[PDB]
RNA sequence: ACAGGCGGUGGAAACUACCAAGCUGGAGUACGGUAGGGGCAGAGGGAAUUUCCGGUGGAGCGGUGAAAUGCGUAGAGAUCGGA
């Protein structure tokens, strides 16, 4: 399983197994970015290139991407992805659903 | 003198008012149907977030017009499981 996290100020990419067990991740901030630069989309395809580079050699030709929330970098982590050797059932995104849960925080000025 | 005010007196009875009976158009009651987040009170439900418990893993996470404070190898963030 890849589990990737998408946002405008950086973007996560976590592998893991089916039981929930990770075995390697990296992101932006690892790949060498910081600051704006983290939440480019090219960021996202280099930083989800390093963290399945490792994992297409150990195996595990299987593979399922969990996106979660929006960014830049979520499409272009895709094309990261797919640009490897390794295929996919589900595509699907565990993104968060609050049923009117909380109250978020105010509206900024500028 | 007119006009106007007060009081008395004899007449007219539409209108305002009074008195005695009538009607139902306004209003209301009894019925028979009907929609709705009307109100009060008591039970039931899920996600989301937060904290704690652990497992996995290892360096950033997070934020900005740009940055830093801040959180983090005393194991954060992320990722499944649970209270
Ligand atoms: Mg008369």
Same mark, same amino acid.
């Given at each position: 399983?890849?589990?990737?996290?998408?946002? !405008?100020?950086?973007?996560?990419?976590?592998?893991t197994?089916?039981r929930?067990r990770?075995?390697?991740?990296a992101?932006?901030?690892?790949?060498? !970015?910081?600051?704006?630069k983290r939440?480019?989309?090219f960021?996202?395809?280099?930083?989800?290139?390093?963290?399945?580079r490792?994992?297409?050699?150990?195996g595990?030709?299987?593979?399922?991407?969990?996106?979660?929330?929006?960014?830049?970098?979520?499409?272009?982590?895709?094309?990261?992805?797919?640009?490897?050797?390794i295929?996919?059932? !589900?595509?699907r995104?565990?993104?968060?659903?609050?049923?009117?849960?909380?109250?978020?925080?105010?509206?900024?000025?500028?």
């Amino acid at each position: 399983v890849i589990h990737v996290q998408a946002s !405008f100020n950086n973007t996560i990419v976590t592998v893991t197994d089916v039981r929930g067990r990770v075995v390697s991740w990296a992101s932006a901030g690892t790949c060498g !970015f910081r600051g704006t630069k983290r939440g480019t989309p090219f960021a996202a395809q280099t930083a989800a290139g390093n963290a399945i580079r490792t994992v297409v050699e150990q195996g595990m030709q299987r593979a399922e991407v969990m996106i979660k929330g929006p960014g830049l970098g979520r499409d272009a982590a895709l094309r990261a992805i797919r640009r490897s050797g390794i295929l996919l059932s !589900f595509v699907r995104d565990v993104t968060p659903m609050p049923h009117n849960g909380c109250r978020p925080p105010k509206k900024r000025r500028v």
